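Retro notes, structure queue

What went well: the backlog is down to a handful. What didn't: a couple of records were mislabeled last round, so from now on we paste the full input next to the output in the thread. Example, using Protease PrtH from Porphyromonas gingivalis W83:
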Amino acid sequence: MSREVKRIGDGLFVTIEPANDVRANEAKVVLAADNVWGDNTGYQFLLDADHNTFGSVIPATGPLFTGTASSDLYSANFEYLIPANADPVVTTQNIIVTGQGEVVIPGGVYDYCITNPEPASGKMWIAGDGGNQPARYDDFTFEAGKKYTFTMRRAG
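Corresponding output:
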């Protein structure tokens, strides 16, 4: 259900700071990664402002999809994305491999998941839950005036 090597997968480590560079009704989300799996595989952050995708478009367990996806899997369901041109393709380069990408979003309620495309296995995996925050989430509140940094690392 999760990508793992030697029973060691990956995970999400969240940091929140005051955001002082956005509007009063805005939050900032950052996705940071540093070649976590050593193979130039990366990550995408998917945000649904309608928070109605958990359990249907975002599966409660297992990868987001395998193999081929409908070309509108993101454009129909997720309003905000990191990177901004993130697309539902396992082979895409529209991923955060090293460094970070960001998105400024309304304060509000969201469903989200973080993906880790792996061409070698044909899976658009959702990242593991071995960090301090689940990598998929139903009705998370991103509060205005705050900056959420989601840092990806290897985890149990």
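Agreed that this is the format going forward. Reviewer comment attached to the example: The two ends are 14 Å apart (CA to CA).
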